[PDB]
Design a binder for this molecule. Structure first.
Ligand SMILES: CC(C)CN(C[C@@H](O)[C@H](Cc1cccc(F)c1)NC(=O)O[C@H]1[C@H]2CO[C@H]3OC[C@@H]1[C@H]3C2)S(=O)(=O)c1ccc2nc(NC3CC3)sc2c1
Lengths: 99, 99
């Protein structure tokens, strides 16, 4: 779809067999969720944002469905105030900006 | 223009008579710059992101040029790791997401 920006661009996600909502975030390089439970091995990672850094778990090659579109890629899990879909996933679903 | 997401969506800005680069950020409600010098009165504000909060100065009704498009609105000034154009400004320039 086309999504305008009068409201936060929140969409419905399926990841790890669980349903969540997440913000389409062109300012995020990576994809971050709080409170999902993903299977298998992970690596600890520190990431930076406004207000400093955050410790996350890094999971690789995770399938995700983003507003009905399929992608696979790295998902970070940690205490983000809102779930975000970043460019690693947005490029796979053909998402662009336009003005 | 249309902007794809293979790279960070960075554009050229003029604000307060100064030239800067900033990220088109659909996950940002507000617009934040580091190291600009804006005129007039401001109000201190605490804002939240990943990794916690940040103290900013809030300036209202600031003119800005975003990739050649004119807007006016609130600009926050404080120690962001990258300058961001948020939805308060993006709606004025007709920016949309599309997939
Ligand atoms: C700050 C930008 C540049 C980056 N962030 C993406 C922005 O869109 C975040 C999303 C958000 C919204 C709300 C609360 C939040 F906690 C977070 N917006 C944000 O903080 O807005 C703030 C600020 C603007 O006005 C209002 O609107 C929401 C809130 C409030 C004050 S990020 O989440 O830190 C992130 C994401 C992925 C990523 N992947 C990385 N990988 C390695 C480097 C390669 S680093 C990295 C860092």
């Amino acid at each position: 779809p086309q999504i305008t920006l009068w409201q936060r661009p929140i969409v419905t996600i399926k990841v790890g067999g669980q349903l969540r909502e997440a913000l389409i975030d062109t300012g995020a390089d990576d994809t971050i969720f709080e409170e999902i439970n993903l299977p298998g091995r992970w690596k600890p990672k520190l990431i930076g944002g406004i207000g400093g850094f955050m410790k996350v778990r890094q999971y690789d090659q995770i399938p995700i469905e983003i507003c009905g579109h399929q992608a696979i890629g790295t998902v970070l899990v940690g205490p983000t105030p809102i779930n975000v879909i970043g460019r690693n996933m947005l490029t796979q679903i053909g998402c662009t900006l336009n003005f």
